[PDB]
Structure formats: structure tokens, C-alpha cells
Amino acid sequence: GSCKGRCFELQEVGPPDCRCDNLCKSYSSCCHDFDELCLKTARGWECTKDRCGEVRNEENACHCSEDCLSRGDCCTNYQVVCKGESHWVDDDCEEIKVPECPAGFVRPPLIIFSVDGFRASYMKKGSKVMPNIEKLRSCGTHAPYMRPVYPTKTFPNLYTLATGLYPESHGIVGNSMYDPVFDASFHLRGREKFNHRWWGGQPLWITATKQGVRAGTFFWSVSIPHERRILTILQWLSLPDNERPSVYAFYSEQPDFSGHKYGPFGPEMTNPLREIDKTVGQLMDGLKQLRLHRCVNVIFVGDHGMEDVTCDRTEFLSNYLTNVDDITLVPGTLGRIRAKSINNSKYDPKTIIAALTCKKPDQHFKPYMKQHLPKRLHYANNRRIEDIHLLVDRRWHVARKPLDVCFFQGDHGFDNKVNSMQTVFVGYGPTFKYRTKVPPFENIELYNVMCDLLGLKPAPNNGTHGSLNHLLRTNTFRPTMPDEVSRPNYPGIMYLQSEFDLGCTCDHTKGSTKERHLLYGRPAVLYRTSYDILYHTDFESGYSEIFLMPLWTSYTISKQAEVSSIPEHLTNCVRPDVRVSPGFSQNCLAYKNDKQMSYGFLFPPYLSSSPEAKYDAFLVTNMVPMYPAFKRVWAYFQRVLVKKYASERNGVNVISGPIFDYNYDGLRDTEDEIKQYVEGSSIPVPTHYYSIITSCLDFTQPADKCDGPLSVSSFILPHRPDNDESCASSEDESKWVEELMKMHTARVRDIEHLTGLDFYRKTSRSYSEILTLKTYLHTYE
Ligand SMILES: *[C@@H]1O[C@H](CO)[C@@H](O[C@@H]2O[C@H](CO)[C@@H](O[C@@H]3O[C@H](CO[C@H]4O[C@H](CO[C@H]5O[C@H](CO)[C@@H](O)[C@H](O)[C@@H]5O[C@H]5O[C@H](CO)[C@@H](O)[C@H](O)[C@@H]5O)[C@@H](O)[C@H](O[C@H]5O[C@H](CO)[C@@H](O)[C@H](O)[C@@H]5O[C@H]5O[C@H](CO)[C@@H](O)[C@H](O)[C@@H]5O)[C@@H]4O)[C@@H](O)[C@H](O[C@H]4O[C@H](CO)[C@@H](O)[C@H](O)[C@@H]4O)[C@@H]3O)[C@H](O)[C@H]2NC(C)=O)[C@H](O)[C@H]1NC(C)=O
Ligand SMILES: C[C@H](CCC(=O)NCCS(=O)(=O)O)[C@H]1CC[C@H]2[C@@H]3[C@@H](O)C[C@@H]4C[C@H](O)CC[C@]4(C)[C@H]3CC[C@]12C
Ligand SMILES: [Ca+2]
Ligand code: NA
Ligand code: NA
Ligand SMILES: [Zn+2]
Ligand SMILES: [Zn+2]
């Protein structure tokens, strides 16, 4: 048939009839007259003086006739040129206290305006280059920058924005991927991306449709120019109440292309930024023309930043591996390695990793088995993520061999904490705040916000719902603190010293402990288990009788506190805990028989308040299994760094503990999932150790008497039997441990997922502020 009267229709027609929608050029299914009827270009996209009040001519791309406003198809500048109206950008900021929408609108619409490769620092260029974007920014709600997901590439980030999920969960783990179950590859170029099997989770357009909220088609065939896309959105916004969508999207491919060619700081970046701003200007003028400029919520959001990268900064795997033709490399600003052929039984990942580990002094990438990547990246739990991963230094590439390789000066893809990868967020409209700055946040949080903006219930996702309530004038969501599942026991003196046969040798009480050492209340255990609260002068812990060690150990170290040494006669001291059964305690004979495994302590003897109290630090209930290699890291943290942090931050409260994540899903392991124990024992081996280090944001107040907001940094250290990750680890600990720790920085939330614990349950702060605190990441950038 014809597309007459159905150009860019909001219902995709089945395989009997031809199509007239946004994507009919991509699946080459358009009616023969789609180009003629739906892609008119005559006289361009702007009204001029001589066209004002013209008789309508159906050949024109947009109209300047008296009927155009009623028909909803004026050029965006019609009112400005023909009716003496002002451009939206020339109007003062005026607070939008309530949505001002035409009658019949049931909710404020949401428009998502996405930009590809828009570096946070581009907003520096100001009104001189981007006057419309700068008005949105300063008038609405904005962050200094927004953290994308890893890898910092287009598709993983665009689908993360839409779903609230990590790539490991939504399935778009790269612009390129191989799936070994499908035995097929996915690429930006090609038809494979159109198959539904790749795309998991529930994107916003689906959440909307399932709950009765109609969505505009988010995507366009590339041959449809930007001006037509804006006019079509404006057209859809003029439909009747029963047909009009409530959510829309526009995606710009700029300024990515120019960034790749000229680099992020080229003079050539100005015009692409002007072009995007012009497009924003057309949307805002068009909205104003329709009287929807104080009705619609607009999000201006980037997918990632852009870095200086040239082909002369390329590492080649052929300089490291002898049999480089036996492997397949996903290359560039990250590396992923698998066997070239599945028939090759000789392929060995251990050999590959070893060959790629600390071989050149300036070496500009580092290899990892995926389960050993920093947990903050959340990049492992998907069969499309190859076992071998290369984290590449900012400014560099990795390639397989030299003949694989100047056509570019910019790239992206690196670690999402790198500054050049940070991107933009602006929220403008009745539901966002007025002239408000908010702290940097992660793009995984936006799905929840977009659902709140539309009155939708979010599908289960990786955001923390409530953590961005402070972006909004009005909230449909009020978060609730979860219910504790397991109540603690508080055991007294229940057992004799001589009743222990553990092979170990050595040469209000509640109220005082709790108020000094648990500043923010007891963590809640959100799963079914059996644990005991143990009180001591210097620290408090929740001891698990199932894992035979603390789930958490909590203590406070003032700026005045003194570092002592473990005296030589107590080096091998481990003491039984009379409150805890011998059958629910560790034993020292397990450690003697296990030739690879030693032990450490969660509360450090080095920071004990007296020689008397120090004895509690050696209790069997404060003991945890530690590889000798890891003890170098842990000893340096406890002996040197905790004190240094207390000094710099005016006291710190520390909560430390074990993490078990053998299946690398970022979630607390059950007993069944633990694959390693201290030899011949029931004592499970942690994959990581965490600490959460809290103090007062106002550091002139000490940590234990803080009136206002809190300040937190945390980490999740991998519990490794070597220090191969750290190329400088033969040197003194002062030259490498802290760099290791900063690489493994983490959010409190990451620790909560991995432990099934809920922190900060008793503070003077609102729960919404606390959720914000829990999503914070200290990046060291
Ligand atoms: C980040 O946030 C994520 C989302 O909350 C967390 O990921 C979730 O993790 C849980 C716990 O492991 C996991 O639960 C398992 O689910 C198994 C069933 O798997 C299939 O179905 C689910 C459910 O689909 C529906 O709901 C999801 C939200 O979860 C929604 O996005 C879907 O569109 C769909 O919606 C429809 O239903 C809901 C109601 O149920 C309606 O509300 C809605 O309107 C819709 O009608 C899917 O999510 C699964 O998807 C995975 O697999 C497909 C196919 O391969 C992939 O394409 C997809 O990307 C996704 O892959 C990821 O997860 C799997 C694990 O499922 C990984 O292996 C993979 O590598 C990816 O990471 C499937 O289609 C279920 O069998 C299993 O049950 C068993 O274990 C539990 C105990 O845990 C026991 O209770 C049971 O008795 C069983 O023995 C378990 O329940 C979710 O599947 C998973 N969801 C997603 C989207 O990943 C993630 O943990 C979190 N991360 C962190 C660090 O916090
Ligand atoms: C981003 C992607 C296309 C962008 C692009 O670079 N195109 C290349 C040039 S051209 O061919 O488009 O002209 C969009 C277009 C259609 C979308 C797909 C839809 O059709 C059908 C599916 C809808 C589901 O809710 C999600 C997955 C699903 C498969 C969509 C995934 C995202 C899809 C594939
Ligand atoms: Ca796990
Ligand atoms: Na040992
Ligand atoms: Na090393
Ligand atoms: Zn991009
Ligand atoms: Zn790009």
C-alpha cells in the first residue's frame, strides 16, 4: 500500500502490509512512497519572513501557514519569525513550581536527549558554544559529571541507561561480543543486533507499555536526518489524548565521531558542539511553540567521555605471546581473549596470563582472569565475557599484532573511574529541581528516576531506589529500610577453657562498647543464619557460627590513638572464646596442616588501647584465614594506613569482614557455593576482604561526635595467594599496597550485595541521604 496518512505511525505493521515507521529503512520494509510522502525536504527546516502566512504546500518539509499550529507541523522557528515570539534560549529562567500542560495531559511527558561521546568537561565551553544546553544546565538540575558503566562504549551504556542494569546482567557486554551457546557474534554493523535474544532485562519502553504508559519509538534509521526526528517528536506530542505517547527519545551520534578523528581537545570539536546545541534549540523552540516548554521533563545525558588516543600508543600481544595466531582478541581500549579454535585442546589460559604479566617496565595493560577484576566494575557474570581480560591504561590501545593497526586521535572504553570517560547529566522540567547542583552519580541509577518521572514501578535493577530522590522536587518513591531477618544471640560465659581442643597456644559493657565502636548502629543480617554479638573494650563483632568467623567487625580509632607492635612472645598466640562453643570455633591445627594458608585478625592487635585489651585481639573468634601473600597487604593496611586515615580525617570508624563470591555474581555465596576450605576443615576461604571507613564530612568534628553528613571510603580487596597483580610488589609495601587498594575501591552498596548486610541503620540522617552515601565511590582521580 501507501504511507499516505501514516508516516512515522506509532504501531509497527505485520508482515502482510508494508511499513511507514521510524525503522522501516533498517529492516528495508518501507512502502514504495515512503520517501516521497514521509521524507520531504523542500525549503529546509526554517521558516523565513516571506513564507509567513503562506498557503499550505504539501511538498514542504515543514510549514509556515496559519493552520500549522493546529496541525502540529510548523517549522520549529515559525512563532519566532512570523509571530514576534522569542527563542526559548533568550527567555529568563523561571522556576517551574508545577507542570503547566494543556488540559487532557495526565502526566508530564519525559524526553530523553542522548549524546554519544560527550565528555563532562565539554560543559566548560559555556554559553559561547552551547547556549541552549547551558540554559538547561544552569536552570535545571545538574551534576559535575556522571559515571558510565564499564566498558565505556556506546551499546553497553545505552542499554544500561535504558534498563538500570550492569552489562553482565542485561547481556550487551560490548559493541562486539561472541556468545558460545548461540555460537554467533554481535557487532554494531550488521543485522545480528536486531535479534531479541541478545537483549535481556526490561528496558524503559517495555516497562512503560506494560503499565499502560505509551512510548514513542526511541530509534531511527540513520538516513532520517535530525531535523525530521525533532519534528516527528513534536508531531507525536500534538496527537489526541488516547494516542499520544508519554515518553520519547532522541539520540545524537555527535560529538563522538569528531572526537575519534580529532581528539577531545581539538579546535575541531567546536562546530559539532554548536550543531548539537542547534538541535536542542529546535526542540525547545518547538516545545515552546506547542506551550509544552514548562510541561515536559527533559534529560540531557551522555553515554561516555573521550580520551587522547593515537595508533603509535598500541601494545602488541605478538611481543608477549609466541603462538599469537592461536587466539582471538577483542582489541582496543580493552582486551578480551579466547581460543581461536574450540578444537584446540592445547590452549591454556594460565600460560597466556603468565606470559602477559609484568614483562615490560612501561607495560600499558594488565591481564586478569575475569573473576579477579575489581568488583566495582561488575564485569564477570556473563558467558559472553571471556575468561581473560586486559585492562588497558588510559591513552593506549592493545592489538594482537602490528599488521592489525593515523586515522584516529580519540577513543574510549577504559575503566569507568578514569576522568576522561566521565559524561554529562542535566534534568530540566517541573519534576526536577530548580538551579540545583547534585553530586556525581552512576548511570545505573537513572532507570529508577525515569520510572518515577513517569509513575512507573521499576523492574528489578542495579540502581538503589531513593539514592537520587534529591534530584527531584516531588517523589513518587519513599524508600523503606529493609527488615532484619536473623536476630542476633548475645551469649554469656558458657564454656570452660579446658573444654577446648583446638590445638592453639598462647603465652554498661555492651553500652560503652556499642557507643564508642558502633557509631551507626548494628548492621542488619538480611538472610537466615546463626550469629552472636561479641563485645570487647576496643571492638565489637557479629560472629557467624556457620562460617566460623565474623561477618563484620566494627571499631573506632581516634586521631590521638597510638600504634603499638605485636610483642615477640605473642606472635603465635590464639585464644579460645569462652562465649562460643568449641564446635562453632576455628582450630589452629587446620592452619598448621594447610601449607599454603596462614591467618590474620579483623580487629588488629597493633591498634589495641592497652596491653590488657590486646589479648582480646588474639581471640579465635577474631581470626580469619589469610594467604601469606595477602598478609603483606593486610598488615600494611592495619599497621600504617588505618592510623594515617584517623590522622587525616579526625578519627575513623572501621567495619571489616570477609566476602565469599566463588561464582562471581556479586552476591553473597551460600554454603553450597563455597569451593575452598582450610585443608581438612570446615573453615571456608574468603575470596575478598572488605573495609568500610567512615568519618564526619566536616573534619573539624571528630568521627564519634559528628552532627552533620558522613564521609565514607570503602574497598573490596581480592584475597589472592600471590601479588602478581602488583608489578612492584618485591619493593617495600609503601611503594605498592595503597595503589592496589585504590584500584579496588568500592561502594558500601557493593559490599552489601556481597555480604547480605545492611549498614548505617542508626544515624541522625534521612534514609535518602544514607542511600546516597551508600552509592558513593571514592575514585582517587
Ligand atoms: C543486578 O540486578 C539484577 C536484576 O535484579 C540481578 O540479576 C538477577 O539475579 C537474580 C538472582 O541470581 C536472578 O534470579 C534468577 O532468575 C532465574 C530465572 O532467569 C530468567 O528469568 C529472569 C526473570 O525475568 C523477569 O524479571 C527480570 C528481573 O529479574 C526482568 O528484567 C525480565 O524482563 C523478566 O520480566 C518479566 O517478569 C517479571 C516478574 O518475574 C515482571 O515483573 C516483568 O514485568 C516481566 O513480565 C531473567 O532476569 C533472566 O535473565 C537472564 O537470563 C537471560 C537468558 O539467558 C539473559 O538474556 C538475561 O540478560 C539475564 O542474564 C543475567 O542473569 C543470569 C541469571 O539469571 C546470569 O546467568 C547471566 O549471565 C546474566 O547475568 C532469565 O530469563 C531463576 O531460575 C533463578 O532461580 C533459582 O535461584 C533462586 C535463588 O537465587 C531460587 O529462589 C530458585 O528456587 C532457583 O533455584 C533466580 O531467581 C535474575 O535472573 C537476575 N535478573 C537479571 C535481569 O539479570 C543482579 O543480581 C544484580 N546484581 C547485583 C550485583 O546486585
Ligand atoms: C540501537 C539499534 C539500532 C541502532 C543502529 O546503530 N542502527 C544501525 C543503522 S540502522 O540499521 O538502524 O539504520 C536499535 C534499532 C532497533 C532496536 C531493536 C528493536 O527493533 C527490536 C527489539 C526491541 C526490544 O525491546 C529490545 C531489543 C530490540 C532488538 C531492539 C534493540 C535496539 C535496536 C536494535
Ligand atoms: Ca556469589
Ligand atoms: Na599454614
Ligand atoms: Na608482583
Ligand atoms: Zn558512544
Ligand atoms: Zn565512539
Would the CB of 721 count as within 6 Å of ligand 1?
no
**Resolution to one decimal, Å:** 2.0
Contact 717, 739 (CB under 8 A): no
Run of H or E including 442: strand 441-442
Run of H or E including 755: helix 748-755
Cα dihedral 9→10→11→13 (10° resolution): 30
- Cα-to-chain-centroid distance, residue 148: 6
Would the CB of 203 count as within 6 Å of ligand 2?
yes
Say which residue the cell 577504559 belongs to.
414
Cell matching residue 374: 575489581
Contact 159, 304 (CB under 8 A): no
Q: Does residue 201 sit in helix, strand or coil?
A: coil
730 DSSP assignment: T
Task: Tell how many helices (H) and how many strands (E) occur in the chain.
Answer: 21, 29
Q: What φ, ψ does residue 613 adopt, rounded to 5°?
A: -60, -40
In a 10 Å sphere around its CB, with 0-12 CB exposed, 13-18 middle and 19+ buried, how is residue 524 labelled? buried
- Cα-to-chain-centroid distance, residue 291: 36
Domain boundaries, the chain: 1-39, 40-85, 86-477, 478-781
HSE (side-chain half, CA atoms, 13 Å) at 672: 0
Run of H or E including 330: strand 327-330
Rounded CA separation 395/716 (Å): 27
How far is CA 448 from each of CA 162, 165, 468, 506, rounded to the nearest angstrom?
10, 11, 9, 54
Contact 561, 607 (CB under 8 A): yes
Contact 136, 426 (CB under 8 A): yes
Q: Which of 26, 170, 209 gets mutated to test ligand 2 (max ligand atoms within 8 A of its CB)? A: 26
Handedness of CA 131, 133, 137, 141 (dihedral sign): positive
197 DSSP assignment: G
- The bound ligand whose nearest atom lies closest to the alpha carbon of 159 is 2
In a 10 Å sphere around its CB, with 0-12 CB exposed, 13-18 middle and 19+ buried, how is residue 366 labelled? buried
How far is CA 354 from each of CA 232, 351, 359, 722, 724, rounded to the nearest angstrom?
56, 5, 9, 12, 9
Would the CB of 591 count as within 6 Å of ligand 2?
no
Rounded CA separation 108/471 (Å): 16
Count of Cβ atoms closer than 10 Å to residue 766 Cβ: 13
- For ligand 7, the distance from its centroid to the CA atom of residue 175, given in whole angstroms, is 10
Q: Is the peptide bond before 367 cis (omega within 30 degrees of 0)?
A: no
Rounded CA separation 20/22 (Å): 7
Tell me the binding residues for 1-tetradecanoyl-sn-glycerol 3-phosphate. 154, 175, 256, 412
Count of Cβ atoms closer than 10 Å to residue 308 Cβ: 15
Q: Which CATH number fits domain 86-477: 3.20.20.70, 3.40.720.10, 3.40.50.620, 3.90.1150.10?
A: 3.40.720.10
Rounded CA separation 224/579 (Å): 73
Rounded CA separation 479/772 (Å): 12
For 238-264, b/e burial (b = at least 16 CB within 10 A) is: eeeeeebbbbbbbbbebbbebbbebbb
Partnered with residue 328 across adjacent β-strands are 338
Q: Which of 163, 168, 169, 210 gets mutated to test ligand 1 (max ligand atoms within 8 A of its CB)? A: 169
Q: Does residue 617 sit in helix, strand or coil?
A: helix
- The bound ligand whose nearest atom lies closest to the alpha carbon of 600 is 4
Q: Please provide the distance, in angstroms rounded to a whole number, between the alpha carbons at the two ends of the chain.
A: 59
Would the CB of 29 count as within 6 Å of ligand 2?
no
Rounded CA separation 616/628 (Å): 23
If DSSP states are collapsed to H, E and C, what string results for 498-558?
HHCCCCCCCCCHHHHHHHHHCCCCCCEECCCCCEEEEECCCCEEEEECCCCEEEEEEEEEC
Cα dihedral 98→102→108→110 (10° resolution): -130
- Cα-to-chain-centroid distance, residue 260: 24
- The bound ligand whose nearest atom lies closest to the alpha carbon of 302 is 6
Q: Does residue 441 sit in helix, strand or coil?
A: strand
Contact 419, 296 (CB under 8 A): no
Q: How was this structure determined?
A: X-ray
Contact 485, 528 (CB under 8 A): yes
Q: Which CATH number fits domain 478-781: 1.20.120.1200, 3.30.420.40, 3.40.50.11540, 3.40.570.10?
A: 3.40.570.10
Cell matching residue 656: 571489616
For 312-350, b/e burial (b = at least 16 CB within 10 A) is: eebbbbbebbeeeeebebbbbbbbbbbbeeeeeeebeee
Cell matching residue 596: 599454603
Radius of gyration of the chain (CA): 30
312 DSSP assignment: T
Q: What φ, ψ does residue 68 adopt, rounded to 5°?
A: -60, -40
If DSSP states are collapsed to H, E and C, what string results for 127-181?
HHHCHHHHHHHHHCEECCCEECCCCCCHHHHHHHHHHCCCHHHHCCCCCCEEECC
SS3 percent helix, strand, coil of the chain, rounded to 5, is 30, 20, 50
- For ligand 5, the distance from its centroid to the CA atom of residue 736, given in whole angstroms, is 9
Closest CA to 534 of 582, 473, 492: 492
Rounded CA separation 275/291 (Å): 24
How far is CA 149 from each of CA 168, 324, 423, 781, rounded to the nearest angstrom?
11, 30, 11, 17
Cell matching residue 310: 593515537
Rounded CA separation 554/552 (Å): 6
Rounded CA separation 400/352 (Å): 13
If DSSP states are collapsed to H, E and C, what string results for 664-724?
CCCCCCCHHHCCCECCCCCCECCCEEEEEEEEECCCCCCCCCCCCCEEEEEEEEECCCCCC
Helices (H), 267-355: 270-289, 349-355
Closest CA to 677 of 582, 775, 549: 549
- Strand duo 141-142 + 436-437: pairing: parallel
Rounded CA separation 500/577 (Å): 9
Would the CB of 206 count as within 6 Å of ligand 1?
no
Class for domain 40-85, per CATH?
few secondary structures
Rounded CA separation 307/410 (Å): 5
Closest CA to 647 of 602, 706, 693, 601: 693
Would the CB of 462 count as within 6 Å of ligand 1?
yes
How far is CA 463 from each of CA 378, 447, 487, 750, rounded to the nearest angstrom?
13, 8, 27, 11
- For ligand 1, the distance from its centroid to the CA atom of residue 282, given in whole angstroms, is 41
In a 10 Å sphere around its CB, with 0-12 CB exposed, 13-18 middle and 19+ buried, how is residue 743 labelled? buried
If DSSP states are collapsed to H, E and C, what string results for 627-672?
CHHHHHHHHHHHHHHHHHHHHHHCCEEEEEEEECCCCCCCCCCCHH
Q: Which residue has the least CA distance to atom 98 on ligand 1?
A: 169
If DSSP states are collapsed to H, E and C, what string results for 227-280?
HHHHHHHHHHHCCCCCCCCCEEEEEEEEEHHHHHHHCCCCHHHHHHHHHHHHHH
Cell matching residue 647: 590522622
Cell matching residue 38: 514521509
Query: For the residues of 50-82, what is the DSSP string, one character each?
Result: GGTTPPP-TTBSSB-STTHHHHT-B-TTHHHHH
Count of Cβ atoms closer than 10 Å to residue 527 Cβ: 11
Rounded CA separation 428/159 (Å): 22
If DSSP states are collapsed to H, E and C, what string results for 448-499?
HHHHHHCCCCCCCCCCCCCCCHHHECCCCCCCCCCCCCECCECCCCCCCHHH
Contact 90, 228 (CB under 8 A): no
Cell matching residue 61: 518539509
Contacts of 189 (CB under 8 A, 6+ apart): none
- For ligand 1, the distance from its centroid to the CA atom of residue 664, given in whole angstroms, is 15
- For ligand 1, the distance from its centroid to the CA atom of residue 169, given in whole angstroms, is 8
In a 10 Å sphere around its CB, with 0-12 CB exposed, 13-18 middle and 19+ buried, how is residue 125 labelled? middle
Contact 66, 53 (CB under 8 A): yes
Would the CB of 264 count as within 6 Å of ligand 2?
no
